[PDB]
Amino acid sequence: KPILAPEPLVMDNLDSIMEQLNTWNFPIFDLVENIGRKCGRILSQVSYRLFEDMGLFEAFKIPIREFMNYFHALEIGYRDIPYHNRIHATDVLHAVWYLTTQPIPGLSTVGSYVFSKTYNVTDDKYGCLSGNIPALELMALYVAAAMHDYDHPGRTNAFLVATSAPQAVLYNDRSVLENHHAAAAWNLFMSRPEYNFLINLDHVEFKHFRFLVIEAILATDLKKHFDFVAKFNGKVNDDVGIDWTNENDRLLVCQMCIKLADINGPAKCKELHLQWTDGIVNEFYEQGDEEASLGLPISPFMDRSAPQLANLQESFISHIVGPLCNSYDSAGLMPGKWVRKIYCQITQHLLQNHKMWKKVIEE
Amino acid sequence: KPILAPEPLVMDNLDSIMEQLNTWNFPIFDLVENIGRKCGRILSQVSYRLFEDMGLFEAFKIPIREFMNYFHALEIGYRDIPYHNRIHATDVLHAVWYLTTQPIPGLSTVIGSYVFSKTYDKYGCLSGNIPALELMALYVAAAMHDYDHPGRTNAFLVATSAPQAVLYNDRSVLENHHAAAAWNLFMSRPEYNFLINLDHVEFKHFRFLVIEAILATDLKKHFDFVAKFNGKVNDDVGIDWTNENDRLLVCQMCIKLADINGPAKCKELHLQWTDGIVNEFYEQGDEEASLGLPISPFMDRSAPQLANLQESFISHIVGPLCNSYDSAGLMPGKWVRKIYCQITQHLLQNHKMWKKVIEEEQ
Ligand SMILES: [Mg+2]
Ligand SMILES: [Mg+2]
Ligand SMILES: [Mn+2]
Ligand SMILES: [Mn+2]
């Protein structure tokens, strides 16, 4: 009855690709091909490596069997849809891990904290978020990333609301998908003792952990995007700036992190970004087909007979991703390298991809 | 499948009690006894009278059969529990109707379709300032706002990881459920479609307003609403009746006051509601004990603390809400210039009563 983790828990044939997790442009589609498309193991295998990298299994005395059981059940419940699938979830988890573990130039760091085995810079002039965000909160962020699109139907909130879908009625039209992802992932977790990887958290810790997970998942609703960005910019630019000893400031940083991780695509290398773009529109077209079937007008960018890739991505960058990156970068939280100047791979890719789409539009 | 409204849709022989709807201390428990306890008709019968009083049937071409079918289905889905039952829903509907239709001293009329009570310079009423569609949303919200309440608090559902708490991610667990279950009920059958003559835009807006009103009844958000309202009252210009967001906030404050009206009623009514509230709490206390949890404050039948419960509820929740609402100039009242406000007078009297009980208990 329970979905259990397969075979030997850890797949041994993935070592050369898994070693490359510590790069921003992780070749996730190579990992997909290496594991097999619809093998249904990518999320659990990556989650294991990242938790091991951070020493989170030891930190919270996490039983590995139950961890693998849960993450396998979770990944199986991501649908076989073109974008909001277990590969995207894995991508978002990798991105939050990267953003929280990799060197950030000029960040001061503060036991209750974990650090990546990949963290090699001995220079005072770098820090990382995992030096400032307690391990319990970091683990909540990582678990949130893994569960944040669970059981996505391949339709937007707007479609669910407009069609009075049962889920939209159930959630009173408020963050319909994001509520469902959190609630269905938590229901799954609670359903079986074979999934209880959090058994060694005390009651207070567990309740706090759950709260943090929910807050992070719910922050992925883009209806709230401008409010988060405005609030963060406010905190950065007030009298003291970000206060790492303040739990509310730390939550806001975690929310900005999962937000950036969710929409990381246009800040990846061209090859990755173009592959993800294909997934996004292919999912949209299935929605467009259903809209037509229901006699509704086809939503912008969702008409397979009239594709608008460049307009979609150019406007997504200009309106959503660009301002979020600028805000996060202004706070001094982007990974980068001293060269002193700073070289920031992430913002460089975003600029390059924005230029690319603009040029497509021009032609 | 569908629950349909009984017999002749409107019960005759209730006329003498129904004529008293236009008083604040409406004798609702006499109405209960007159209709019959667990007749399961009180909410639909009162709903009919108030919609008729406002001419809402004509205003929105509402078919009476479908209206009665829906409101009867709705009332049947309120459980037989001591407080959050169909009698409380009826009470809250009556209170929102009273607050929106009765004379308010010095309230100006906005310079939309509006409706007025058949019961209606120096006075105004809210129904003169809030469009009929929005008023109707508020009334429907009041009727559905505790639908299928299980007789346990949000905090209990959250602490016990109840399926509803998991479903709603611990956020306004009951209130989300009331709205969602009442709307699901509505949509389930064509026999319930009393809003058939609203156009699509109107319907979607109506649904939004109903949800916003029901969700506003979560007391976790109490101080946020009060602070926001006090902000709007005391800013540049005050309440702007032509502003849809200001109007929504007023409607939310209205349903909030209506929900917790009990301590602002005459002693007889307040004491009867108090008995219901604690009896429902004690069932929760019994279950807490059964589950090996500590018994929540005020929920221990072996050690009742009615006076401490109600004194603190008035001082911390009802009192500040009334003060905020009164500061906005929205309380029904009479010119004596000074104003005489029955509602705040009752609240003062009940507060004094509980304080005296506490004094004798020490
Ligand atoms: Mg999502
Ligand atoms: Mg309630
Ligand atoms: Mn996502
Ligand atoms: Mn209520």
Give the burial class of A168: count Cβ atoms within 10 A of its Cβ; 0-12 exposed, 13-18 middle, 19 or more buried. buried
Chain B residues interacting with chain A (CB cutoff of 8 angstroms): 161, 163, 166-171, 176, 179-180, 183-184, 187, 207-208, 211, 215
Length of chain A: 363
Alpha carbons within 13 angstroms on the beta-carbon side of residue A89 total 35
- The resolution, in angstroms to one decimal, equals 1.7
CB contact under 8 A, A183 and B170: no
Whole domain around residue B339: which residue ranges? 14-361
CB contact under 8 A, A172 and B166: no
Domain membership flag for residue A342: yes
Report residue B103: phi and psi, to 5°: -60, 135
| End-to-end CA separation in angstroms for chain A | 56
> How many Å lie between the centroid of ligand 3 and the Cα of residue B221?
29
Ligand nearest to the CA of A258: 3
Nearest to B113 by CA among B97, B127, B95: B127
Distance CA B228, CA B234 (A): 10
Residue A70, H or E segment: helix A64-76
Domain membership flag for residue A7: no
Contacts of B187 in chain A (CB under 8 A): 164, 169
> How many Å lie between the centroid of ligand 1 and the Cα of residue A223?
11
Position B60, amino acid: F
Work out how many domains chain B is built from and give that number: 1
Residue A280, H or E segment: helix A270-293
Distance CA A27, CA A18 (A): 10
Contacts of A169 in chain B (CB under 8 A): 180, 183-184, 187
Query: Two tokens at B95?
Result: 């209170």
Which of left, alpha, beta for B303 (phi over 0: left; psi -120 to 50: alpha)? beta
In this structure, the number of other CB atoms found within 10 A of the CB of residue A2 comes to 12
User: What are the residues whose beta carbons fall under 8 Å from the beta carbon of A279, sequence distance 6 or more?
Assistant: A82, A83, A88
Domain membership flag for residue B121: yes
CB contact under 8 A, B168 and A182: no
Ligand nearest to the CA of B95: 4
- Specify the CATH number for the domain of residue A58: 1.10.1300.10
Closest CA–CA distance from residue A206 to any residue of chain B (Å): 12
Closest CA–CA distance from residue B166 to any residue of chain A (Å): 6
Domain membership flag for residue B148: yes
- Backbone CA torsion sign across A344, A349, A352, A354: negative
> How many Å lie between the centroid of ligand 1 and the Cα of residue A221?
6
Nearest to B344 by CA among B261, B269, B268: B261
Domain membership flag for residue A208: yes
Distance CA A171, CA A150 (A): 16
> How many Å lie between the centroid of ligand 3 and the Cα of residue A223?
14
Contacts of B170 in chain A (CB under 8 A): 210-211, 214
For residues B46, B47, B50 and B56, what is the CA-based torsion angle, rounded to 10 degrees? -160
Examine the residue annotation and report whether A181 is marked as an active-site residue of this protein: no
Distance CA B117, CA B66 (A): 23
User: Are A219 and A255 within 8 A, CB to CB?
Assistant: yes
Domain membership flag for residue A184: yes
Domain membership flag for residue A3: no
DSSP string, B173-198: HHHHHHHHHHHHHHHH-GGG-TTTTS
Report how far apart, in Å, the C-alpha atoms of A50 and of each of A45, A138, B36, B197 are. 9, 12, 65, 57
Instruction: Choose, from B84, B94, B177, B178, the residue flagged as catalytic.
Output: B84
Domain membership flag for residue B8: no
